[PDB]
Each structure stands twice: as C-alpha cells, then as structure tokens.
Amino acid sequence: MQDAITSVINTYDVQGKYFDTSAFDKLKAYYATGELRVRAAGTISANAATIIKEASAKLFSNQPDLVRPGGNAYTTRRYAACVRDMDYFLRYATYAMLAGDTSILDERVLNGLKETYNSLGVPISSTVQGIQAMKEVTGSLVGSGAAKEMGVYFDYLSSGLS
C-alpha cells in the first residue's frame, strides 16, 4: 500500500530528484489535513457498528427483496456475509482516508472482487448501493468537512465494483 507521502517520495525517486517547492507544498497539504483525518478515523471507528446498522437498514428498506427468500441476502449466513462485507468496505475506506491514497483499496479490496462476486452470485449493483448508504451515513456523522474526504474513497470503491 501507499500513502500520500510515500507517493511523493516514489515520484521524486523515479526521477532521481530532490524535493522542491511542489513536493513540499503537497507534503504540507497532507500534514495540514492530518488532524482532520485522525478525527474522522476516530469518529468512524467508534461508530462502525452504528454506521453498518443504519446503512444496511437503508439498503434493505430500499431493496427488501434481498432479504426475502430468493434474495442474495436471504439466510442468516448470507445476511451475515453481507453486513460483514459492509464492515470490510467501511474499515478499508477508513484506512484509505488515513492514508490519503486509494492504493490499499486496489491492493486489498478490489483485487479480484468483481469476479468473486460474479462467481458467487452477489449483485454488484446492490453492493454499490450499500456502499452509497454507508457514504451517506458516514457523512452525516463525521461532519461536512470530512464528508467529502470520506466520500472520495467510498466513490472509489463504488467505481471499482462498477
């Protein structure tokens, strides 16, 4: 995985160049956003169960057929797997938000997830709407400033599935 700082380091390493004003400016931007990111990560970690409850409730009220017989979330095992996947997305989006890059999202989440759902039979569009529900719930929680920062990585996950 990669952070913003590591990304700048790698870019200036492949050039064999020392840091300049642009690199220092990017590093300052990350350092300035750091405390906001830490506050958002703490708020999300404290309320992960509540966020998952609200988002899954919204998803299964918008799409009730998922949990009635015949739906992909109809069994205790399959419902638990669904809310477990929602936990995955939330935790890894928090990791990415702290990191400042989406590299962890590619490497540790989206690496072969689409074909895994395809073979399992998981409805990708419904999962994307669940991620959207988590985005709305989390934005209502962390605050206006951190909402867009979180929604960047939530949208990255959604676009990775779709």
Binding site: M1, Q2, D3, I5, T6, V8, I9, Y12, D13, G16, Y18, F19, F24, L27, K28, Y30, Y31, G34, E35, V38, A41, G42, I44, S45, A48, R91, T94, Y95, L98, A99, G100, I104, R108
Partner: protein, 160 residues
C-alpha cells in the same frame, strides 16, 4: 511511512486503529513542518554536504582514490560522490516519511549483493555514511541534528 506502518499493523489484526495508533499519527502530522524544514535545509545545501563528505571519506581512506583503489580516477570518484548524493536523497526522504522505510526500500534491500557485484568495500560505505552524517548534522541545529543522526546511523548499520 508512519501512517503506512500503523495501517498495516491495524489491518493485520482486521481492526480499526486504536487510540494509540491515532495518537502516533497525530504526533507525526503535528511534527510535519519541522521535518519539512529539516529536509529543505538538507536539500538546499546538498552540494556542500556531498563535497565535504567526500573530502573526509578520501582523507580517512586515501587507498580508495589511490592506484589500485576502487575510486581511482575522475569517473569513479564521480560515481562515489553520486552514491553519496543518492543516500543523502534517501535520508531526506526518510525525514519527510518519519521512518527509514524509503531508505530501506531504495538503498538497503539487496545493497550487499549490489556492492559485491561492483567490488565496493562495505566499510568504505560505512565511513562515507559517517562522514555525511557529521557534515549534515553540522548544518542543522542540535534538535534537528538529533533526529537526522538516527537516520544516518540506521543507514550506517544497514550497510555494516
């Protein structure tokens, strides 16, 4: 960096970051401007650091630039100075990163095989790194030279 290490540690246990990890990252980001100023000072005076450090290195081990030495000649001495410049850049990267991961990943993993295939004496590298440490810590204040010394000592131990 520090953030990457904290995130990987949290991910190994499949948990969110604890208050201790968050406090570590908070202390790292709070100290960003200081290490950025240190790195800017090191990079703005890099030519002086490299020239002086090469001078102490060649004084301590004239056999390197002597006939039969690995650094004898203009081009070989230039390669020596360019390696010193490489490692100065890695030290600045480590400063901004908050740990020695950039140094470890660009200049340490496989360095022994590299310098063996190149016929470069490792103690020569260790003392060149020590010379860069002395010269670079000369430019900084005591507090900044304090943390810069740890990165240079890590590099010296890794080569050794």
């Amino acid at each position: 960096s520090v953030v990457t290490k904290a995130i990987v540690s949290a991910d190994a246990e499949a948990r969110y970051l604890s208050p201790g990890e968050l406090d570590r990252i908070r202390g790292f980001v709070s100290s960003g401007e200081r290490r950025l100023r240190v790195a800017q000072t090191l990079t703005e005076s890099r030519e002086r650091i490299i020239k002086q450090a090469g001078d102490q290195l060649f004084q301590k081990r004239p056999d390197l630039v002597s006939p039969g030495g690995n650094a004898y000649g203009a081009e070989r001495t230039a390669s020596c100075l360019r390696d010193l410049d490489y490692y100065l850049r890695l030290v600045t990267f480590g400063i901004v990163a908050g740990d020695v991961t950039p140094i470890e990943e660009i200049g340490v993993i496989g360095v022994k095989e590299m310098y063996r295939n190149l016929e470069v004496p490792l103690p020569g590298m260790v003392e060149a790194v020590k010379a860069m440490k002395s010269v670079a810590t000369g430019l900084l204040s005591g507090d900044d030279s304090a943390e810069v010394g740890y990165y240079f000592d890590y590099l010296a131990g890794a080569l050794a």
